[PDB]
Structure formats: structure tokens, C-alpha cells
Amino acid sequence: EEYIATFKGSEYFCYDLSQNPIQSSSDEITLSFKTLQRNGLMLHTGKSADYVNLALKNGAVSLVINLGSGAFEALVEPVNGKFNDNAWHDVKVTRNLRQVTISVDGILTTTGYTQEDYTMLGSDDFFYVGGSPSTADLPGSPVSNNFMGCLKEVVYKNNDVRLELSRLAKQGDPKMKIHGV
Ligand SMILES: [Ca+2]
């Protein structure tokens, strides 16, 4: 059973981190996405200088991460055809301390490091999936559009926690809320 959610441009999931803050020196994020749109927020967590932002930005997969001492921005461009071709594309983001790697469809990979010395991502805000109350204003966001398309199997995990966000949205949770205009 996969857990697939459809977004139409005015919707998002919102997982409440206030009582179980993210405090992570190494993370992984996986999902698959399907869309016809060039721009859209896939996922975000964090405020101020600690954040992770994942989005399609003019057809490329865009990831911006900051651990509090300066952001890294990774773009993955398509090679043959397009990511917004309404076929499923798998995303994987792996971070160990400051080392960041994102791969799309296994093969297409951009790797780098967040700036300077900070290794810890802190977030007691919300984990957003598919959009947010005001996407343009999210730290590190290159887009203002919520997602319009499908997202499945969204998982954030570190050594302490595993957040099966797509499963939680589908199955229900006290900390999980679905918003639609
Ligand atoms: Ca930090």
C-alpha cells in the first residue's frame, strides 16, 4: 500500500512538530512526485536560519537547506524530456552533518555542503507537504506556488525518528492536519 495524496494548488498537509522538535545531525527524505506544473512546493520545515525546502522550480528539482550557519541550494535538472511530464519521479535527499545529496530517479544527482560549521537541524514548527499558508514567505523557498499534482510516500527520518508523512495524512494523527481552501 502506497500513500498517495493529490494537491490542486490550494491544499497542504501540516504536521505539528511543537511537542516533538526535529533535532538532527543527519537526515533522509524520500518521496515521489507527479505534476504538469513547472513550479510547486513539495515540502518544507523550519523557520529563521534552520530549514529544509523542497520544490519544483521552473521544472527542476530544487532543494535548499540551512543548518543555521548558511544555506546550500541544490538544483537537479532533467536530461531527456521533463520532470513535469506527469510521470512519477522519485526523490531522495541524504544529509550527513553538512554533506547534502539529492538524487532524482536514481541517476540524476547534485551533491554539496551547507555553509561553514553548523551540523544540527532544529525545527519545532511544522512539517509542510504539498504547500503551506504562505509559500512565498517560507525561508529558502524559490517558489510561491503550492504543489499541483501528486505526492506519495513522503518520509522524513533521522536516527531517532521516522515520520511517514504520507501515511499519517492518509491514516490520520492528532498532530497531522489537512488544509484546503
Ligand atoms: Ca542548527
Side-chain angles (χ1 to χ4, degrees), residues 2-106 108-181:
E2 292 168 311
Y3 298 102
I4 303 177
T6 297
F7 305 83
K8 288 297 173 178
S10 323
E11 304 74 45
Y12 63 88
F13 308 149
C14 188
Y15 187 81
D16 179 356
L17 296 170
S18 63
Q19 303 199 65
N20 313 265
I22 284 172
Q23 276 185 80
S24 169
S25 63
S26 85
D27 292 315
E28 182 178 301
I29 293 174
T30 52
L31 56 76
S32 302
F33 73 87
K34 189 184 108 182
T35 183
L36 289 168
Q37 300 310 305
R38 291 183 178 84
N39 301 290
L41 188 75
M42 301 183 204
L43 102 205
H44 179 90
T45 188
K47 289 194 178 168
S48 301
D50 283 57
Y51 49 88
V52 181
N53 186 97
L54 187 66
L56 211 68
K57 163 50 179 201
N58 192 30
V61 181
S62 163
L63 171 76
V64 185
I65 304 196
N66 191 342
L67 309 177
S69 63
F72 173 51
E73 296 141 52
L75 197 78
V76 179
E77 297 168 31
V79 176
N80 301 295
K82 294 171 165 188
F83 290 144
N84 63 309
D85 64 350
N86 219 20
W88 286 108
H89 301 286
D90 313 311
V91 177
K92 177 168 172 168
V93 184
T94 295
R95 174 195 149 243
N96 183 59
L97 313 174
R98 303 164 44 244
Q99 190 182 40
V100 179
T101 300
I102 179 168
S103 295
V104 188
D105 293 334
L108 306 162
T109 302
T110 297
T111 191
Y113 294 80
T114 52
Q115 299 180 44
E116 305 184 355
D117 55 338
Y118 282 15
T119 63
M120 278 265 185
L121 172 76
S123 178
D124 71 348
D125 197 49
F126 293 96
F127 224 117
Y128 295 110
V129 180
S132 75
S134 171
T135 288
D137 297 314
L138 289 174
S141 179
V143 302
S144 61
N145 295 286
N146 299 148
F147 207 69
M148 191 177 207
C150 297
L151 302 173
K152 65 176 173 172
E153 303 296 277
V154 183
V155 178
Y156 168 88
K157 56 145 163 180
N158 55 47
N159 196 30
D160 294 323
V161 83
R162 176 185 184 83
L163 300 181
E164 290 179 350
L165 297 171
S166 289
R167 178 188 67 82
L168 292 166
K170 175 74 198 178
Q171 292 188 340
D173 197 81
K175 307 173 189 172
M176 175 58 74
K177 300 297 180 234
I178 300 171
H179 303 265
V181 176

